[PDB]
Design a protein around this ligand. Structure first.
Ligand code: CO
Ligand code: CO
Ligand code: CO
Ligand code: CO
Ligand code: CO
Ligand code: CO
Ligand code: CO
Ligand code: CO
Lengths: 420, 417, 418, 421
């Protein structure tokens, strides 16, 4: 146990009385509304989101990186930190690895995961940066590079990711690349996309029968003029071209200003190409901030579309959700904990929406009551539900407060030497 | 009473039991947080926001307008409908008039106002459209038009708005114009602004000493290349140049994409030039949608700055808040009702912020706990306080439900073409 | 001759000398560049773009409309005005009609266009506004409205547009609706889209073998929260679903801030769904400003994709281009004239691009020389070519000057109601 | 000379003929327009823009940095590369230094500059990153940090930049900081700004009589929720508050999407607070791309405002312009060369605007002709002027071509060790 059980128990006991009061009060309010609080809690305690191994370390910008104390040394230190997030929130049982950053003997990775009670989610390839001893640079691209040798090298790396994933229990490969141009004319849009499609087709060949290949669109950065996989439209063309095993990943902060993101989610679902959603928040661009910290209502609206899919009876809809954030000014462990909480928060709220009433207001074009129907769900403070779900599953009523009480950061700070 | 008191009473009793349960539960939860729910309710029942006379009728776009039934025929019908908003929400006791749309015997206006239990907020001039018999067109601008005669006409119009305002009890004049250009080179940025400043100086000269002159910035529309009063920066220069009685109005949907609007509010407050906030919500441009319907957190963050100004003890801070929305696909009255409700919702939540805790987390640079401190307030469902505040002041526990149960829309539908 | 031939001739001879100088100098410069100026001029004079019948009237905003003098009373006055643009620029041979605004006797329309030297392009349906006596309001939608009867009414209207078009020579129907929602929850995104697809399928069935059905995306307005056909992504799904005769229209001002519009053009072409491009310019949203008045380089880059498509030999690629603008502060005829010119300006510069050189820098990943290769074409002032092309084809060397010299505005102003 | 004179001479001669043809053709067309080409060229050859010392090294993003060959290490390597840009374009005689990156003995800096034919422009402080051994971290801010000792350290560092600048001929300190917040509530907007203003007042006290203090606004990055000096409105408030010696810097890519930047430029000039403009181009955010590579017309429109002010010499108008870009996928030297060219290009075209005619169309509200008046100047291919200006001043007719013909990049690559072969 990364966090002492007695600490968790002690902090839970200290907040038990208030939780009892808030939960029962909420339960009665929900009951008056025709909702069984126990049914919501039961689903909430089963909602999981993958944590990125690269998120437990402090992030930075091109201007600077301000590391905190006890930064994880390698993938093993990262898994140990991810274990804390899962133990306290019980909402992140799976970790998403990034190759070559997390490269290590698959058997050891698996053994560490099992010992910590962590599983492994989608593998993530890396052809947006150069590794040492690399025959060809990705400066001008990878899978869509003009040079065939460079594209084949990118393909082999991705195939390697699949091999590592197969050995640790992963069932998917996420592909996000920086491929694009910074100047008009630098790239022939169409030829670059044709090259990308051919490369991906190669990667697709290496997928096991029960694996998925996820392509992730991004409007810009690292490319500042054009990006090959720039939006969901190109993303759809990709998945539809590759085949049944290919789907699209929607990363919240990867869209143009004012984009109606929840609509994109609904569209991809309608055409069965929503592989998953990558959570984070933003105000300006791909800020990679804590989910829900900037626009909590938008996060709720995305979940409303995810829950409606279930309500409409969409078949075989098992999206792979993951958090993809960069924590530049907070303890990474604490930010991921509260971000996972916000994600469960919005999910619980989407579960509260009176779909019956909603359908009636949509049918009658009663816009005001339709929006108020969503608001009645969203305005509901579901924290007691999230808290109780944690208590029941061995987690903490107040994750961050328990984390701080355990003095975990100080402990790892003393165990881990800062880089020189 | 636009709405029968017996209907109000009925629709309140029907929900009183549930409200009592919710209010008490919240009272206990707030007590555990060291907050007296009674103190919050007392503040909420006193929070008012002006309603735009022109928002009570159905709005439309350049593509089309789809009026509903019982549309107001003029200012008097508009006041009648505004009276419904005030009676049920008790959060909009003052109406903001727009001239010449609402031109009418000032004495008559005041009469109906008093009768309906309404007052008049800031006056709104209109030099972004031409009126009947108007000598010069405002097609190429008004207060900053290249033609002197046009500018003088614009100035005179604003002065007339002041005269009408003084007669009905208004204490401020709001000036928003579309002045700008649609092509590069069309206007000379600096000269157009110089002309605007001089005209506003004339208007300012005709201001009573207990009056204020509000200028309102907008990034674009109707001008699609440049706008004289395009942002708060230009707006500040305007207020600073004109004088102590001149301040800046901040309309939520009037800023560039991703603008940090709450920061703009803070800046203006710090330099004492925040005349008021024009509430509404948006996703794309100046959508003029129901407040909080798109980004309720942003609305709360704006109120966080408003409430912090008080906690910081800022003096003389008494901003003139007003709703400025267009209701294209809903009953204007219901939208205004829920919007005014949302504005009080954000205010109440802001009142819940533990300032001491927040202050400590900011000084120590504990970003996570600092943001969590705001969320603890924001995540609180203050609806019970809003409903109770209304109930205690003669309003409806559920305004829209009561509005619909009264059949008011059907009634005016019969009385109007 | 809507504009006296003596004026045109006079205004041309008055500038003919300077033009020969500029044209001969440019011809020399291009020659030093291995470019035959005559080849460029021959292509330019053949480039056309449809003009919107509703474009010759003064537009406005939700705040106000300031009409000028001599405002057209209807389609016939509009056609008389469109004839002016075509006579002087020789770049707008066809006019795009909008129903019910231009509803009239097909024979009348055709006879007039033939007499004015104008043809008829894509038809435009209108279910984003209510007409007198209309049985069902489009307030909450049309082709995607929740009410079956309302959708049927919208479908019937579109089919009626096809009938009108068949009688006047049109070969395409363009569908742009305001369908969407202003509030979260008001609409169920998927169900609305399904309804839309089903209605469009009914319209598709009524298409002649040689007709095309164009769907046009728009991020927002009149809908301020969500729009059924919000972007090219949804638009592609529509075109692919409907069939071979269904394609996508890209209107420049209809995208999110900072969107790379030229890429959307390349993507739709790659998959054979680029029905056409609707020209205009913008800085904030769907401003509908004169083409190239805000970002002429972007206009150029859009044409770079169009020209590259031809150069690569893309099969069956014949976009249905049209101008879609709102003129709120200028004489509508003059803006359309210069907009059409701005379009040909960008087209001509795109033609000057050394494709082999660009291709080489692209393969070598020489980003600097690649962008410079485009700039060498873009920086070139091709005004002489545009001017010469107009002169040789019966147009005006300086269109707007000739237009103002003819005193046409004052004329129609005296013949039309205030 | 970084580049051999014989190479410059040879490459100029190779293009001399075509240039004469185009220049004469343009001078003729301009003559017919009532414009004397010589009057333009004369001003163009005198238009300079400072080059950032950090601009000659390959840039990167948070995801990666892909260095090219012969990367300059240290300020001396950088000045050597900046010297190339000046020799070939003659538009970048001064270099802007960044402390602590370019920290070195002033006497040696001055000497190396004089030797290369380079002068020194505005000094640039750095409190948006941490230096080794630094007492206080700038993680949560610098000049506006809640910790007093941290602000003091920030202030002392800026004062140190002023001292270095005084020793090498600089007359200004440019201050761009990352100070802001990533989460609502993290910072108290007003208090942070009050702390910032108080700290800047201290720096202001250390300014010589003939020095200027430039503050630079940026909408976001590194801060992703709020930034203390977020826009020109806040920036104006800073300058006005600080005093006559404080002005504002406008960096093209530091504004919200669709912002009308040329208007901001006009407003600052009107109120005498436009300290300078930092050139680069962008499409999505602060992309720091090559000037004019994305929106050349916007660049011209900014210069239309500058040229107008320049003609009618306005009180307080003496801009300290500088290029501030990141070259992630091109030879930094080549990009800076073509960027400086674009800057002069817009300047030249703005110089061709018929102000009398423009003023007329503006007074009559003839929007169509007003915009066309601007376009007639913008559409003019002024390359002949730019190239003739360079040729007359010891530069190269085609700068990049000459740079490539010289083999300079290959030359420095053999002199400077890369990280790997
Ligand atoms: Co992601
Ligand atoms: Co990202
Ligand atoms: Co307003
Ligand atoms: Co507005
Ligand atoms: Co449009
Ligand atoms: Co269009
Ligand atoms: Co800068
Ligand atoms: Co920057």
């Amino acid at each position: 146990f990364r966090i002492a059980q007695d600490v968790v128990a002690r902090e839970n006991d200290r907040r038990a009385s208030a939780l009892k009061e808030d939960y029962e009060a909420l339960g009665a309010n929900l009951a008056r509304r025709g909702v069984d609080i126990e049914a919501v809690t039961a689903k909430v305690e089963k909602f999981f989101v993958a944590v990125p191994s690269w998120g437990v370390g402090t992030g930075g910008t091109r201007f600077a990186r301000f590391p905190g104390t006890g930064e994880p040394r390698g993938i093993f230190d990262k898994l140990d930190d991810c274990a804390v997030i899962q133990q306290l929130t019980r909402a992140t049982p799976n970790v998403s690895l990034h190759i070559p950053w997390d490269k290590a003997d698959p058997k050891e990775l698996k053994a560490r995961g099992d010992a910590l009670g962590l599983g492994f989610d989608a593998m993530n390839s890396n052809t947006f940066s150069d590794a040492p001893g690399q025959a060809h640079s990705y400066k001008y691209g990878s899978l869509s590079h003009t040079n065939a040798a460079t594209r084949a090298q990118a393909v082999e790396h991705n195939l390697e990711c699949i091999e590592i994933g197969k050995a640790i229990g992963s069932k998917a490969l996420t592909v996000w690349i920086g491929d694009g141009s910074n100047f008009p004319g630098q790239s022939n849009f169409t030829r670059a996309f044709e090259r990308y499609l051919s490369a991906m087709a190669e990667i697709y060949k290496g997928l096991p029968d029960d694996w998925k290949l996820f392509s992730e669109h991004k409007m810009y950065e690292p490319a500042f003029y054009s990006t090959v996989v720039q939006d969901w439209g190109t993303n759809y063309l990709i998945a539809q071209t590759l085949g049944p095993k290919a789907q699209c990943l929607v990363d919240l902060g990867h869209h143009a200003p004012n984009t109606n993101i929840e609509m994109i989610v609904a569209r991809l679902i309608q055409f069965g190409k929503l592989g998953g959603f990558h959570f984070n928040d933003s105000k300006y661009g791909d800020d990679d901030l804590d989910a829900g910290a900037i626009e909590p209502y938008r996060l709720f609206l995305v979940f409303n579309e995810l829950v409606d899919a279930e309500a409409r009876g969409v078949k075989g809809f098992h999206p792979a959700h993951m958090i993809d954030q960069s924590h530049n000014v907070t303890d990474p462990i604490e930010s991921l904990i509260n971000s996972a909480n916000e994600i469960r928060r919005a999910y619980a709220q989407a579960l509260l929406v009176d779909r019956a009433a909603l359908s009636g207001y949509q049918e009658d074009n009663d816009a005001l009551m339709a929006t108020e129907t969503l608001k009645r769900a969203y305005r509901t403070d579901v924290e007691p539900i999230l808290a109780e779900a944690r208590r029941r599953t061995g987690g903490a009523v107040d994750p961050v407060a328990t984390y701080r009480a355990s003095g975990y950061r100080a402990r790892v700070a003393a165990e881990r030497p800062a880089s020189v």
